Enzyme design. Structure first.
Site, PDB file in Angstrom:
ATOM      1  N   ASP A  58       0.864  -1.175   0.000  1.00  0.00           N
ATOM      2  CA  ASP A  58       0.000   0.000   0.000  1.00  0.00           C
ATOM      3  C   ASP A  58       0.903   1.228   0.000  1.00  0.00           C
ATOM      4  O   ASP A  58       1.895   1.275  -0.713  1.00  0.00           O
ATOM      5  CB  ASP A  58      -0.895   0.002   1.244  1.00  0.00           C
ATOM      6  CG  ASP A  58      -2.184   0.782   1.046  1.00  0.00           C
ATOM      7  OD1 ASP A  58      -2.662   1.434   1.995  1.00  0.00           O
ATOM      8  OD2 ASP A  58      -2.735   0.738  -0.065  1.00  0.00           O
TER       9      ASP A  58
ATOM     10  N   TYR B 224      -2.025  10.905   2.425  1.00  0.00           N
ATOM     11  CA  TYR B 224      -2.815  11.265   1.241  1.00  0.00           C
ATOM     12  C   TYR B 224      -2.871  12.772   0.994  1.00  0.00           C
ATOM     13  O   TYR B 224      -3.431  13.203  -0.010  1.00  0.00           O
ATOM     14  CB  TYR B 224      -4.264  10.830   1.430  1.00  0.00           C
ATOM     15  CG  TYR B 224      -4.592   9.340   1.412  1.00  0.00           C
ATOM     16  CD1 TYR B 224      -5.023   8.717   0.236  1.00  0.00           C
ATOM     17  CD2 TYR B 224      -4.560   8.580   2.582  1.00  0.00           C
ATOM     18  CE1 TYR B 224      -5.368   7.374   0.215  1.00  0.00           C
ATOM     19  CE2 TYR B 224      -4.906   7.233   2.571  1.00  0.00           C
ATOM     20  CZ  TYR B 224      -5.313   6.639   1.383  1.00  0.00           C
ATOM     21  OH  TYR B 224      -5.655   5.306   1.366  1.00  0.00           O
TER      22      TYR B 224
ATOM     23  N   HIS C 173      -6.672  -6.974  -1.613  1.00  0.00           N
ATOM     24  CA  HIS C 173      -5.717  -5.900  -1.339  1.00  0.00           C
ATOM     25  C   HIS C 173      -4.960  -6.102  -0.030  1.00  0.00           C
ATOM     26  O   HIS C 173      -3.915  -5.498   0.190  1.00  0.00           O
ATOM     27  CB  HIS C 173      -6.424  -4.542  -1.316  1.00  0.00           C
ATOM     28  CG  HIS C 173      -5.585  -3.439  -0.748  1.00  0.00           C
ATOM     29  ND1 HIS C 173      -4.733  -2.677  -1.520  1.00  0.00           N
ATOM     30  CD2 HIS C 173      -5.462  -2.977   0.520  1.00  0.00           C
ATOM     31  CE1 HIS C 173      -4.121  -1.794  -0.750  1.00  0.00           C
ATOM     32  NE2 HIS C 173      -4.547  -1.954   0.492  1.00  0.00           N
TER      33      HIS C 173
END
Ligand SMILES: O=C(NCc1ccc(Cl)cc1Cl)N1CCC(Oc2ncccn2)CC1
Ligand SMILES: O=C(NCc1ccc(Cl)cc1Cl)N1CCC(Oc2ncccn2)CC1
Lengths: 545, 545
Positions: free
Chosen positions: A332, A463, A521
């Protein structure tokens, strides 16, 4: 109700006892010469003194030789020119390998509530090559509640005392205990003390018998998960990289340094299944609490989460740890980080590896926000941007959160497109989410507790730099990655799809590739065994050489 | 007032620049061919692009070749059959070694209040052998406040910007700064910006000049101490070995595991001078807070401090850390512990070493208390025995305590015989003790802070099992130590005198020996440099092989 396993011949199959014979044949020696010379004098004998911890193994060899001079002499034979008990035993000991299925069984009974224990007659090994014994005694040791070695207690099987001893250390009645052993003699005292006894030869009958009296299937049981991690039983490290920034991690194993960089929103624990494997495989594993997570500092400012500083801090982490380089493996957001590491600090990076995360060149001509609307499934990324909105929503129900995110391919319960319009992230998901196959209720709650510390501000701030990352990332548009790298794709990862990595070859010429079908994921918990396969192969292949 | 040093040619002497010429001679090439081909195009040139971080070193080689094809071509020569720029540079880089005296100087100025910094034009190294660069860049890095690399900042000397940059990162005026460099060209922009400039060739003139303008002697200055440890800048580890027993330690370096076991009453920090050395020497150092000390659990019960359990807990420590074995080095009570380790857990012990502490067989026929009155200088040991008495006296003035104990041979201020009669331990010593040469006031206070946690109960409890230790110790009277061991004696250690070890050979046949003259009982701080010499030699010699 508990279960006890001998080492030699039970959990570790080629039996030292059996290699003697093989030497006798091989050497054209009188059947039983070695075995008889091995136990001359009974309990006064070299061997028993050795088992009792009275003398070291090196002290025993000479003592074992002489027996063979005498034993050869009574049978009136010759012992070959270069005949050596040292060499015979070296090979043997190091010829002994775990009995995976027996071990399997212990792990099951254990997991099924059983108290387990290795009860072995064993010496104190001071050879040069002793490491190979210590090395295996650790593999095993961990998956048992107890290890009882004749050489420390001062007692040997089949002395009834060591049995009582074991019994009393077990805190059980003879009737509650099962006991498998290759040596009938050693079964008798346990037997006649009342406990169950299994005679082991083929492991298959020995297990048939076990499952029979436990009422628990051990034979031909499914593919069991890789060994996990109990946070308590771990080693936890802390290094300050900056005045107000401590990084925490988990250390285990020895060898080249392997540095595990998790993703969003996880923890060092998101590597639980691979941390024991890599150690065993022979590397030094250091699982990061990445900045913002759990037991590592979590500064509120956005800009403290751009890659530049995150890497600047990994370098500095290696500084304070005595490390020239480490192999970086990420997933990730961690898989991304690792890419900047290989891109800006080749010196400090032995080899790099990403799970899911692809190497995407930054478009000079394209503000990464523009490149955000495109690919609709990247809507939630937007939803984060605004300091406050998402933190609130995600910190509201901690348990709900992780339960909702940690799901196999098909267990999904979120549509991370239309997220902004929807007005949130779990807008249309439960509050009572059922528990995935991947996690127990206790593996969820763990994540829960980690985040009560630093909340979600920090993790969401990763982010919240892009304009900044991107800009940093442009400088390296001249460069190519020429160190050893490995890219591993997951089939059912909707966000990070295998096809975004399609172009990584233009950038990393001798990029190695690993794929994993039927995987989501959360590659670590969804496919722990395969994750292990791909990474260990590439580690032996591409790391230390 | 601050000082800045170039890497190549200043702190790292064989200059990559100079090895080119040596290749030209060696290779019968036209003087300057390589150097001219090294910088074709000026700032647009391969090399400058490399210095700017635009391309990796591996990306540069081909780009460097072609220059040499052209440069050979204009001079109309041939380049040898197997001519390779890769190989030429490998050797070179790895032929570059620290300039110990320049480094010396940086350390002095630094210690003298100066802000120091390496300002180097350097590439991003992605060769296979890049480790050797990273490895040296770490040695150095640590002894400076800053490292500025052209390849990260994006700027190269002699661009005046990197100077301003450096200036602004220094937070100093040009007039406050000294700047040594081998390349006159790079001095000019700093010079003309106002800072001092030194041209380096011989290091001796370069230093004469430095001491001249600093007013601080750097040239022919005394034998400087080994690099120490700043607790903040360290990595601190925690492992639970038992439910109510956490052990703390300091990790640094990579290689075989070296485990440092301090004595009474000290701390992991009592190894400050050897912790950096061993790391550099290429081992993985783990300095223990031994049970009872500082940041490790400190249970009040006496019996939790017998050797058996202390070792049982080191084993268990290695369990939870992924370690088959570690080399055990101990001092004082730690040197003792290490002896039980080699005696009861050869498996788990790569090699053992004691500082001061001798291997004494336990007398079967003699209660170790009897053996306490004999040798009068063993009176204080008695004084401890009684839970309460000594704790009180030692916890009364913390600072007074350590100041009073930590003293060179001749700085002594205690007569540890007649202690009982005297009615205490510091009965006839000051309360204002002067500060030893061995410790600064700040290295004392440290010990002070560690003990405000667990007090002295715990540490004194080590002396409070003997009847128990002794009994445990008798079992091993059959055994001999056959793993690699090293015994190091101190001349002026009144308590642990070199002559008690006189008989250790009857027990450890190939025992290696190290001695240290003019040394007291605090061997680590009294003789850090020699301690380093003896241990590193034996480590290369006897550990990994
Ligand atoms: O959103 C994430 N991670 C969180 C995440 C991913 C997938 C799923 Cl199912 C759930 C969650 Cl929470 N990333 C996107 C940005 C990063 O960089 C990147 N680079 C290239 C292409 C795409 N992304 C990868 C991690
Ligand atoms: O007293 C200590 N250490 C504390 C100590 C020693 C010397 C000095 Cl100057 C000051 C202090 Cl505080 N020991 C005695 C008991 C131990 O075991 C031993 N074994 C054989 C012979 C002697 N001792 C060694 C450590």
């Amino acid at each position: 109700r508990a279960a006890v396993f001998d080492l030699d011949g039970v959990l570790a199959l080629p039996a030292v006892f059996g290699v003697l014979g093989r030497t006798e044949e091989a050497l054209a020696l009188p059947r039983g010469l070695l075995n008889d010379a091995f136990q001359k004098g009974g309990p006064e004998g070299a061997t028993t003194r050795l088992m009792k911890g009275e003398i070291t193994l090196s002290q025993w060899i000479p003592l074992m030789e002489e027996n063979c001079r005498k034993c050869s002499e009574t049978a009136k034979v010759c012992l070959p020119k270069n005949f050596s008990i040292k060499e015979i035993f070296d090979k043997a000991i190091s010829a002994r390998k775990i009995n995976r299925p027996m071990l399997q069984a212990a792990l099951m009974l254990r997991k099924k509530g059983f108290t387990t224990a290795i009860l072995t007659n064993t010496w104190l090994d001071d050879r040069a090559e002793r490491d190979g014994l210590a090395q295996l005694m650790c593999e095993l040791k961990m998956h048992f509640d107890f290890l009882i070695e004749s050489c420390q207690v001062g007692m040997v099987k089949p002395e009834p005392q060591i049995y009582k001893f074991l019994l009393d250390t077990l805190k059980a009645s003879p009737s509650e205990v099962v006991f498998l052993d290759d040596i009938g003699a050693n079964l008798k005292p346990a037997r006649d003390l009342g406990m169950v006894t299994i005679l082991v030869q083929d492991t298959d009958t020995a297990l048939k018998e076990l499952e029979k009296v436990t009422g628990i299937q051990l034979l031909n049981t499914p593919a069991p998960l890789p060994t996990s991690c109990n946070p308590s039983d771990m080693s936890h490290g802390y290094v300050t990289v900056k005045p107000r920034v401590r990084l925490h991690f988990v250390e285990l194993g020895s060898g080249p340094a392997v540095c595990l960089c998790h993703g969003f929103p996880e923890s060092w624990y998101s590597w639980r299944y691979q941390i024991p494997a890599l150690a065993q495989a022979g590397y030094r594993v250091l699982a990061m609490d990445m900045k913002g997570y759990g037991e590592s500092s979590a500064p509120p400012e956005i800009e403290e989460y751009c890659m530049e500083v995150l890497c600047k801090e990994m370098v500095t982490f290696l500084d304070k740890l005595g490390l020239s380089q480490a192999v970086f493996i990420g997933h990730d957001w961690g898989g991304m980080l690792v890419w900047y590491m290989a891109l800006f600090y080749p010196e400090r990076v032995r080899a790099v590896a990403s799970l899911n995360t692809p190497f995407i060149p930054a478009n000079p001509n394209m503000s990464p926000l523009e490149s955000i609307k495109a690919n609709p499934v990247f809507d939630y990324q937007l939803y984060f941007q605004e300091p406050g909105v998402a933190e609130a929503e995600l910190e509201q129900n901690l348990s709900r959160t992780f339960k909702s995110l940690f799901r196999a391919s098909d267990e999904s319960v979120l549509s991370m497109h239309k997220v902004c319009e929807a007005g949130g992230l779990f807008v249309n998901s439960p509050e009572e989410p059922s528990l995935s196959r991947m996690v127990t209720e206790e593996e969820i709650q763990f994540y829960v507790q980690q985040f009560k510390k630093s909340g979600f501000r920090g993790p969401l701030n990763w982010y919240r730099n892009m304009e900044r990352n991107w800009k940093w990332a442009c400088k390296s548009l001249g460069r190519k990655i020429l160190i050893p790298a490995l890219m591993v794709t997951a089939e059912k990862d909707f966000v990070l799809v295998p096809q975004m990595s399609q172009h990584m070859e233009d950038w990393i010429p001798h990029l190695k590739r690993g794929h994993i079908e039927d995987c989501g994921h959360w590659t670590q918990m969804d496919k722990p065994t395969e994750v292990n396969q791909i990474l260990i192969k590439w580690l032996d292949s591409d790391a230390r050489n």
